[PDB]
Amino acid sequence: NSEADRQLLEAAKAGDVETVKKLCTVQSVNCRDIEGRQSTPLHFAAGYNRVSVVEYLLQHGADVHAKDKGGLVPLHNACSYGHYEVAELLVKHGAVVNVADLWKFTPLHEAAAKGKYEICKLLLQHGADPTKKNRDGNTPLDLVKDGDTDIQDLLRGDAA
């Protein structure tokens, strides 16, 4: 990476909007972190709940569909750690809720496995499919832990 790209990525990880504003260009907004997993600034801002930076990035050309080395999109990252506002923002900017990574995990597999009730609810409201099997043959419902009966209820979708 160029020193400037490195600086932008750290600024995104940190939620440093003022620095992001300084460095963010057409050329850099979707740069990849070569030293990590080819994460974009938006991947980092999403995983670390940097809401103001996610807003800025999304308004300035950031790619919600960018895949990292594992095939993860920034929505996977937000969903894994329960970042509701970030997830909501990504979906508003056209994130596809059923997109799958290299292990065929969707963001709903992730939210389910991580026990994130509101994230699961948000994804389902936007048409996420709780029946999609990953590489292991597991659906998101399969990945819900025994005691998370609320998330089970949600993904099972009993008639209502």
Binding site: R37, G47, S80, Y81, H83
Partner: peptide, 13 residues
């Protein structure tokens, strides 16, 4: 090849 945890953390709003 195992799937690694996604990049991120449980950073409070």
């Amino acid at each position: 090849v195992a799937r690694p945890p996604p990049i991120g953390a449980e950073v409070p709003n």
